[PDB]
């Protein structure tokens, strides 16, 4: 139940493991557990499907609202800080969740980590987050260069969680990666991803 995220040099790349299971019902394994806030913004959640999609809906509606009312595309920090404030309101029931909100804005590319009870803090080009966090750091930081493009970055994220997957027992098969290079908003989904990882694992 783990997430990673990295700035390219020409986009934001984030990845999410598919499987969330509660009891004997698998909630996600074939379905969305990654949400579109805006066109140039994504949000990846490590944690439960119900809490994630209902909260994401809110962030999405105030994301479209910001854009319409003020006729200017939002900054990353605005949305970020806004999600933090929301998590203060409902804190009486499970809402504890590990979030990355990133994508692109006017001042560049950014990703911001929101702590589970509030706050928002920043990460220069590498974040993780999730339960596989320790394992993901080794992978992302090792293969990072300052000239790292989008192409090898979508691969890099897949390797970090799938290496995590072994140190976890919670985490199972399937992964979604999202690439927000600015010219396309693609949700790779398991089928493409598994075939890319067929060389980097076998």
């Amino acid at each position: 139940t783990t997430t990673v995220g990295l700035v390219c040099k020409d986009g934001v790349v984030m990845a999410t493991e598919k499987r969330a299971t509660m009891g004997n019902f698998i909630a996600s394994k074939a379905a969305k557990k990654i949400y579109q806030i805006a066109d140039r913004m994504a949000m990846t959640t490590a944690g439960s499907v119900g809490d994630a999609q209902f909260l994401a809906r809110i962030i999405k509606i105030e994301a479209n609202l910001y854009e319409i009312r003020r006729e200017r595309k939002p900054t990353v920090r605005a949305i970020a800080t806004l999600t933090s404030n929301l998590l203060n309101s409902y804190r009486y029931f499970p809402y504890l969740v590990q979030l990355l909100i990133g994508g692109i804005d006017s001042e560049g590319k950014s990703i911001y980590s929101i702590d589970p009870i509030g706050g928002a803090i920043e990460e220069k080009d590498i974040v993780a987050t999730g339960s596989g966090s320790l394992t993901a750091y080794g992978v992302l930081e090792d293969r990072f260069t300052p000239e790292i493009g989008v192409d090898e970055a979508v691969e890099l994220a897949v390797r970090a969680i799938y290496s995590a997957m072994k140190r976890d027992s919670a985490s199972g098969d399937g992964i979604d990666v999202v690439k927000i290079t600015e010219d396309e908003f693609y949700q790779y989904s398991p089928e493409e991803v598994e075939q890319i990882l067929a060389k980097f694992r076998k």
Partner: peptide
């Protein structure tokens, strides 16, 4: 500045 961490645009 609280709710978006950004100053307000004069228009808004």
């Amino acid at each position: 500045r609280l709710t978006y961490d950004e100053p307000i645009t004069v228009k808004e």
